[PDB]
Amino acid sequence: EMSVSAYLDRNGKPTCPIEARSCYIDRENRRYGEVRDLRSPQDAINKRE
Amino acid sequence: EMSVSAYLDRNGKPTCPIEARSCYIDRENRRYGEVRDLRSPQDAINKRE
Amino acid sequence: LANGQFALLSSAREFIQRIGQNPSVLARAQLARQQAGMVDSAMALNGLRRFELAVYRQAWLRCRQFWKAPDYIRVTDDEGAPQFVGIN
Amino acid sequence: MALNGLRRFELAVYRQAWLRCRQFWKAPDYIRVTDDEGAPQFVGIN
Amino acid sequence: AEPILGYENALAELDVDINIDAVPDTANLAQEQFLQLTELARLYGPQEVPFDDLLELSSMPEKTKLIAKRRERSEQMAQVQAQQ
Amino acid sequence: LEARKQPATYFNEVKLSIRGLVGVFEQGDSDPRAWPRNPQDEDSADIATK
Amino acid sequence: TMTMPSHAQLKAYFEEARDANEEYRKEAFIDRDYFDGHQWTEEELQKLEARKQPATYFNEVKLSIRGLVGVFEQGDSDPRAWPRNPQDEDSADIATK
């Protein structure tokens, strides 16, 4: 199926309903989170054991 | 397109709407921030490890 | 060179507790966590609240154009409710 | 410094935003926002 | 009249008599109006800051369906204290 | 590690930093609310929060 | 008086502002990818792999920024106009509404 989107917006024109948000962004477009960190300080507890 | 700017100012004459501000300035015109510092004391934790 | 390894693991069991394990799991009496612990988790916890109240805004646009007059009366349960939202 | 420097940027845009909602809003646009007939008489019209 | 300090309106301009400045956050302007009234009403008391002046500009969910069920009781009682 | 006949131990200290950080968000939940911007016939149109 | 500038002294303005101010603008992008990982250059990262060594970093410069934005982000502000003298200037304080 293929049609103009049925849902409107605050201006009256039809738009998208999908909404989302990411935690951090990089210079080239990466979307990392929180556990992108705590990996280099956590391979140094498993390996130094 | 090319025209006289449409937006006025507090004196009546047409001006710019763009406004901005930088953190620090140098003798020759550099615009550094806060993490221009904390790089020399932070390459000495990664390297001395 | 094993006492040089114990002093180099214990430098990484302590950083892993200081960058990550701040969110009120460290154990002062509601001062080293009410102004000192919840200000390091202020970004990306007051960023997820901003997503959550941006869906409620996107949900009033959908329960406006589809709910006619006898649908506001079923929910709020008062005859004379849809006159306050721009109909009749 | 540089936290009472960013406040100085933020309240310098609000100043730049009253100049734009003055020269473009005519008399029936102040009444829609503040919702009181008899509001634009206080800002230099009529 | 003429522009006297280069002010072509002489009623509301940026320099003289507006002075944009920041302030801490609220939800609506009625709630900010509510905070510097109960602070001021606390020093005087419940003698000269009554209801309909501190309940009306509050931050209570349903008050229009409560301010009219209390205004009616001070009106069917005033018909007793007038006909008596 | 299996060729040295050694167990493969790990100390999962990165679940602790997430499990207590979701639990702050998860406790302070919220139901929505609409604020009428000026009480001249705008609180009557606050059926929306109901 | 004169006429409007025509496409040769407009590229000559954009190109003066790219020939100069590139010393910090190429340096501020180093500061960007210095607080989200990437604290190792491509020559140092190649040599650590020849010793079969992991490339560990302790990102202690995200901590100093994440708690410093969070002070600004909590103490937010809605605007406000102050009438300078209450002789018919508080009536003209519809502006803050």
What residues of F are in contact with residue A45 (Cβ under 8 Å)?
Answer: 11, 13
C-alpha G28/C-alpha C36 separation (Å) is 30
In one-letter notation, the amino acid at residue D46 is N
| Helix, strand or coil, per DSSP, at residue C69 | helix
Q: Do A41 and C54 touch (CB under 8 A)?
A: no
- Answer whether G50's CB lies under 8 Å from C24's CB: no
C-alpha E42/C-alpha E34 separation (Å) is 12
In sequence order, which residues have a C-beta less than 8 Å from that of residue E58 and are 6 or more positions away? E30, E34
Q: Do C43 and G60 touch (CB under 8 A)?
A: no
Tokens of G29: 């992008």
- How many other C-beta atoms can be found within 10 angstroms of the C-beta atom of residue D11? 15
| Helix, strand or coil, per DSSP, at residue G81 | strand
Q: Please tell me chain C's helix, strand, coil percentages from 3-state DSSP, rounded to the nearest 5.
A: 45, 0, 55
Any G CB within 8 A of D3 CB: yes
Any A CB within 8 A of G31 CB: no
Per DSSP, what are the bridge partners of residue G78?
Answer: E23
- How many other C-beta atoms can be found within 10 angstroms of the C-beta atom of residue C47? 14
| Helix, strand or coil, per DSSP, at residue E81 | helix
Neighbours of chain F (3+ CB pairs under 8 A): A, C, D, E
- Answer whether C19's CB lies under 8 Å from A40's CB: no
Tokens of E31: 């709630």
Look at residues A41, A43, A21, A18 and name the one whose alpha carbon lies nearest to residue A31: A21
- Answer whether E29's CB lies under 8 Å from G78's CB: no
What string of DSSP letters covers E14-68? HHHHT-EEEE---SSHHHHHHHHHHHHHHHH-TTTS-TTSSSTTS--SS-HHHHH
Method by which the coordinates were obtained: cryo-EM
In sequence order, which residues have a C-beta less than 8 Å from that of residue E7 and are 6 or more positions away? E13, E15, E16
Per DSSP, what are the bridge partners of residue G81?
Answer: E20
| Interface subset of D 20-39, CB within 8 angstroms of E | none
Q: Do A34 and F21 touch (CB under 8 A)?
A: yes
* Chain centroid offset of residue G24 CA: 12
C-alpha C19/C-alpha A42 separation (Å) is 12
In one-letter notation, the amino acid at residue B29 is N
* Residue E82 CB-density burial (10 A; 0-12 exposed, 13-18 middle, 19+ buried): exposed
Per DSSP, what are the bridge partners of residue E22?
Answer: G79
- Answer whether B6's CB lies under 8 Å from B12's CB: no
In one-letter notation, the amino acid at residue E75 is E
Tokens of A42: 């956590």
Buried b (16+ CB within 10 A) or exposed e, E62-73: ebeeeeeeeeee
DSSP state of C22: -
C-alpha E68/C-alpha E71 separation (Å) is 5
- How many other C-beta atoms can be found within 10 angstroms of the C-beta atom of residue F13? 18
- How many other C-beta atoms can be found within 10 angstroms of the C-beta atom of residue D43? 19
Neighbours of chain D (3+ CB pairs under 8 A): B, E, F, G
- Answer whether G32's CB lies under 8 Å from B33's CB: no
For tokens 């639990």, the residue is F23
C-alpha G5/C-alpha F37 separation (Å) is 47
* Chain centroid offset of residue F16 CA: 15
C-alpha G4/C-alpha F24 separation (Å) is 60
Look at residues E14, F45, F46 and name the one whose alpha carbon lies nearest to residue G92: E14
- The H or E element containing residue F16 is helix F16-27
Look at residues E29, E28, E34, E66 and name the one whose alpha carbon lies nearest to residue F35: E28
- Answer whether C25's CB lies under 8 Å from F16's CB: yes
Q: Do C41 and F13 touch (CB under 8 A)?
A: no
- The H or E element containing residue F17 is helix F16-27
Look at residues E27, D43, E57 and name the one whose alpha carbon lies nearest to residue G83: D43
- How many other C-beta atoms can be found within 10 angstroms of the C-beta atom of residue A17? 13
In sequence order, which residues have a C-beta less than 8 Å from that of residue B36 and are 6 or more positions away? B24, G27, G31
Apex CA B44: angle with CA B41 and CA B48, to 5°? 155
C-alpha E37/C-alpha A1 separation (Å) is 60
Any D CB within 8 A of E9 CB: yes
Instruction: Show the beta-strand stretches assigned E in F1-50.
Output: none
Q: Is G37 left (phi over 0), alpha (psi -120 to 50) or beta?
A: left
- Answer whether C72's CB lies under 8 Å from F45's CB: no
Tokens of A19: 């909404």
| Helix, strand or coil, per DSSP, at residue D32 | helix
Any A CB within 8 A of G29 CB: yes
Q: Do B23 and D12 touch (CB under 8 A)?
A: no
Tokens of G18: 């790219």
Apex CA C76: angle with CA C75 and CA C80, to 5°? 120
C-alpha G48/C-alpha G58 separation (Å) is 16
C3-11: Cβ within 8 A, 24+ apart: C5/A48, C8/A48, C8/B49, C9/A44, C9/A45, C9/A48, C9/A49, C11/B49
